[PDB]
Design an enzyme around this catalytic site. Structure first.
Site, PDB file in Angstrom:
ATOM      1  N   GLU A 130      17.605 -34.737   5.133  1.00  0.00           N
ATOM      2  CA  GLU A 130      16.784 -34.160   6.155  1.00  0.00           C
ATOM      3  C   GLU A 130      15.452 -33.705   5.568  1.00  0.00           C
ATOM      4  OE1 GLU A 130      18.827 -31.078   8.264  1.00  0.00           O
ATOM      5  OE2 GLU A 130      17.140 -30.867   9.735  1.00  0.00           O
ATOM      6  N   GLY A 169      15.981 -25.288  14.209  1.00  0.00           N
ATOM      7  CA  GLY A 169      16.731 -24.243  14.908  1.00  0.00           C
ATOM      8  C   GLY A 169      17.925 -23.652  14.161  1.00  0.00           C
ATOM      9  N   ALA A 170      18.593 -24.448  13.314  1.00  0.00           N
ATOM     10  CA  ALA A 170      19.783 -23.989  12.563  1.00  0.00           C
ATOM     11  C   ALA A 170      19.644 -24.046  11.037  1.00  0.00           C
ATOM     12  CB  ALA A 170      21.044 -24.733  13.024  1.00  0.00           C
ATOM     13  N   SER A 171      18.694 -24.825  10.533  1.00  0.00           N
ATOM     14  CA  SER A 171      18.374 -24.780   9.087  1.00  0.00           C
ATOM     15  C   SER A 171      16.879 -24.941   8.829  1.00  0.00           C
ATOM     16  CB  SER A 171      19.168 -25.825   8.289  1.00  0.00           C
ATOM     17  OG  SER A 171      18.701 -27.132   8.531  1.00  0.00           O
ATOM     18  N   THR A 172      16.482 -24.663   7.590  1.00  0.00           N
ATOM     19  CA  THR A 172      15.099 -24.842   7.156  1.00  0.00           C
ATOM     20  C   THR A 172      15.063 -25.556   5.798  1.00  0.00           C
ATOM     21  OG1 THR A 172      12.897 -23.820   7.043  1.00  0.00           O
ATOM     22  CG2 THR A 172      14.680 -22.579   6.021  1.00  0.00           C
ATOM     23  N   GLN A 173      14.124 -26.497   5.651  1.00  0.00           N
ATOM     24  CA  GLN A 173      14.053 -27.347   4.435  1.00  0.00           C
ATOM     25  C   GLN A 173      12.736 -27.143   3.720  1.00  0.00           C
ATOM     26  OE1 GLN A 173      15.191 -29.045   7.570  1.00  0.00           O
ATOM     27  NE2 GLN A 173      16.963 -28.037   6.725  1.00  0.00           N
TER      28      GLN A 173
HETATM   29  N1  ANP Z   1       7.522 -26.639  22.246  1.00  0.00           N
HETATM   30  C1  ANP Z   1       8.043 -25.565  21.596  1.00  0.00           C
HETATM   31  N2  ANP Z   1       7.389 -24.380  21.550  1.00  0.00           N
HETATM   32  C2  ANP Z   1       7.901 -23.321  20.897  1.00  0.00           C
HETATM   33  N3  ANP Z   1       9.086 -23.393  20.263  1.00  0.00           N
HETATM   34  C3  ANP Z   1       9.775 -24.560  20.277  1.00  0.00           C
HETATM   35  C4  ANP Z   1       9.257 -25.679  20.942  1.00  0.00           C
HETATM   36  N4  ANP Z   1      10.134 -26.692  20.810  1.00  0.00           N
HETATM   37  C5  ANP Z   1      11.169 -26.226  20.060  1.00  0.00           C
HETATM   38  N5  ANP Z   1      10.958 -24.923  19.746  1.00  0.00           N
HETATM   39  C6  ANP Z   1      11.837 -24.021  18.953  1.00  0.00           C
HETATM   40  O1  ANP Z   1      11.601 -24.177  17.541  1.00  0.00           O
HETATM   41  C7  ANP Z   1      12.836 -24.210  16.812  1.00  0.00           C
HETATM   42  C8  ANP Z   1      12.917 -25.518  16.053  1.00  0.00           C
HETATM   43  O2  ANP Z   1      12.910 -26.602  16.992  1.00  0.00           O
HETATM   44  P1  ANP Z   1      13.345 -28.068  16.530  1.00  0.00           P
HETATM   45  O3  ANP Z   1      12.502 -28.380  15.306  1.00  0.00           O
HETATM   46  O4  ANP Z   1      13.439 -28.936  17.714  1.00  0.00           O
HETATM   47  O5  ANP Z   1      14.843 -27.732  16.009  1.00  0.00           O
HETATM   48  P2  ANP Z   1      16.089 -28.731  15.964  1.00  0.00           P
HETATM   49  O6  ANP Z   1      15.645 -30.070  15.440  1.00  0.00           O
HETATM   50  O7  ANP Z   1      16.738 -28.718  17.332  1.00  0.00           O
HETATM   51  N6  ANP Z   1      17.179 -27.924  14.848  1.00  0.00           N
HETATM   52  P3  ANP Z   1      17.784 -28.482  13.312  1.00  0.00           P
HETATM   53  O8  ANP Z   1      18.980 -29.281  13.735  1.00  0.00           O
HETATM   54  O9  ANP Z   1      18.188 -27.212  12.629  1.00  0.00           O
HETATM   55  O10 ANP Z   1      16.629 -29.212  12.628  1.00  0.00           O
HETATM   56  C9  ANP Z   1      13.950 -24.076  17.835  1.00  0.00           C
HETATM   57  O11 ANP Z   1      14.392 -22.731  17.731  1.00  0.00           O
HETATM   58  C10 ANP Z   1      13.294 -24.346  19.189  1.00  0.00           C
HETATM   59  O12 ANP Z   1      13.773 -23.535  20.273  1.00  0.00           O
HETATM   60 CA    CA Z   2      15.133 -30.809  13.323  1.00  0.00          CA
END
Ligand code: ANP
Ligand code: CA
EC number: 3.6.1.-
Length: 419
Positions: A130, A169-173
């Site tokens: 990822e 939303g659940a991890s950071t890289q």
């Molecule tokens: N357009 C937006 N504006 C503000 N916040 C957002 C927006 N879209 C997504 N987010 C928030 O930003 C965070 C990261 O979003 P995103 O990068 O889509 O995570 P993800 O791919 O679902 N999670 P992961 O599986 O951990 O990579 C989440 O907490 C979302 O609710």
């Molecule tokens: Ca993601």
């Protein structure tokens, strides 16, 4: 010209997105050649949100796959590869229930196999994948893998690469090219791209994505304060405790409690600080939680929720964030707003609004205390989500790898001219 196409479904913790990529059929091994053609955002939650109703995970994909049928020319459907990769939502579900996980994957697989594309599988990516694939994406799009110069006069040092920070939303890289010795094999990455070796550091912090950090802070606030210092004064909600403590990320921390904000920047800062364990390091140097990390170096792109949060601070709060001190100040100011003051800045929908103080605070601390950016290194960080009209993320890099579109060496080794 004669175009080829490929499709990646990005199955994140909080969302599914579909990307259609296209490239010239006869320039396909050039760096920066593949670009985004179209995308589609699946309505509702991520596939892991259907843990207890797996057949719906497949069905959630249908509207975007119907779009892919229109986006990609019909004579090309059959030879267009389609991949689904899942990230930390699914990694977390696998910790709870490998069986529910398997069923969600069966359900998406069953749905994707009904379509005329060359479906090449649904897989869960490792944290390393990822990280590395987002790093490949950014640097591919920006043509940082080009060998700059000409015969007898090559630029030295070689063109620098862009580090990648992804706040999901659940991890950071965190991922970047480094000259430091590796001390941990789990963090060490070696790539051979266009005849060049890149020594790369990567790490994925599970439970340090935006949504999971918000849950941990809530759990912490409920336990320590019985108010939420990171929420703005006048904001309150009914908290379902079942939902707070069901995550693997918080289960280590009266079905309903009322919880109200207090716009207390300093207690918010104190609350956020507990997220980072800096007490021991088995290596010469650590980020946090005992994880090896070499000094950050070079430029960085910070996308996903890094971008969304900085965008909020700049565009909505109208605050500068060009320095770590500025970001810290912007955070205090945001945290000190009342719920009425905050809402008045946002005429439209207010989802996420009460959480910006907490996330900005987390981001500030993550960069400064976790990764050890200082003023000099942070100057080299840019906040962007798009490069060359393509969304930055791991999906392009993933498709590039699985379609074997990045050559290890140039054709015929460019006659040895880069030796
Ligand atoms: N357009 C937006 N504006 C503000 N916040 C957002 C927006 N879209 C997504 N987010 C928030 O930003 C965070 C990261 O979003 P995103 O990068 O889509 O995570 P993800 O791919 O679902 N999670 P992961 O599986 O951990 O990579 C989440 O907490 C979302 O609710
Ligand atoms: Ca993601």
């Amino acid at each position: 010209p004669a175009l080829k196409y490929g499709i990646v479904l990005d199955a994140g913790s909080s969302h599914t997105s579909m990307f259609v990529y296209k490239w010239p059929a006869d320039k396909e091994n050039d760096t920066g050649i593949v670009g985004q053609h179209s995308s589609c955002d699946v309505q509702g939650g991520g596939i892991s949100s259907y843990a207890n109703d797996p057949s719906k995970a497949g069905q959630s994909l249908v509207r975007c796959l119907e779009q892919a049928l229109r986006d990609v020319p019909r004579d090309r459907h059959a030879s267009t590869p389609l991949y689904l990769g899942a990230t930390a939502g699914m990694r977390l579900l696998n910790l709870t229930s490998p069986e529910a996980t398997a069923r969600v994957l069966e359900a998406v697989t069953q749905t994707l196999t009904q379509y005329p594309f060359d479906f090449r599988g649904a897989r869960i990516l490792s944290g390393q994948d990822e990280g590395v694939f987002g790093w490949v994406t950014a640097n591919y799009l920006l043509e940082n893998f080009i060998k700059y110069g000409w015969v007898g006069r090559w630029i030295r040092p070689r063109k620098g690469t862009l580090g990648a920070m992804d706040l999901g939303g659940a991890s950071t890289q965190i991922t970047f090219e480094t000259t430091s010795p590796s001390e941990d094999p789990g963090n060490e990455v070696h790539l051979r791209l266009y005849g060049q070796h890149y020594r790369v550091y990567t790490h994925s912090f599970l439970c340090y994505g935006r949504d999971q950090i918000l849950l941990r802070l809530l759990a912490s606030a409920l336990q320590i304060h019985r108010f939420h210092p990171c929420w703005p004064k006048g904001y309150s909600t009914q908290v379902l405790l079942q939902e707070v403590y069901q995550s693997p990320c918080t289960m280590g921390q009266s079905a309903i409690v009322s919880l109200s904000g207090t716009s207390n920047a300093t207690l918010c800062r104190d609350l956020v600080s507990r997220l980072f364990n800096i007490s021991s390091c088995p290596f010469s140097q650590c980020s946090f939680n005992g994880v090896f990390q070499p000094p950050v170096a070079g430029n960085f792109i910070a996308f996903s929720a890094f971008y969304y949060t900085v965008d909020f601070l700049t565009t909505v709060m109208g605050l500068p964030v060009g320095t770590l001190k500025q970001l810290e100040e912007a955070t205090e100011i945001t945290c000190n707003q009342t719920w009425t003051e905050l809402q008045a800045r946002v005429p439209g929908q207010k989802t996420r609004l009460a959480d910006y103080c907490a996330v900005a605070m987390f981001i500030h601390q993550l960069l400064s205390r976790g990764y050890h950016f200082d003023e000099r290194s942070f100057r080299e960080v840019v906040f962007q989500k798009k490069a060359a009209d393509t969304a930055v993320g791991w999906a392009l890099g993933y498709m590039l790898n699985l379609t074997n579109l990045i050559p290890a060496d140039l054709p015929g080794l460019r006659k040895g001219t880069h030796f």
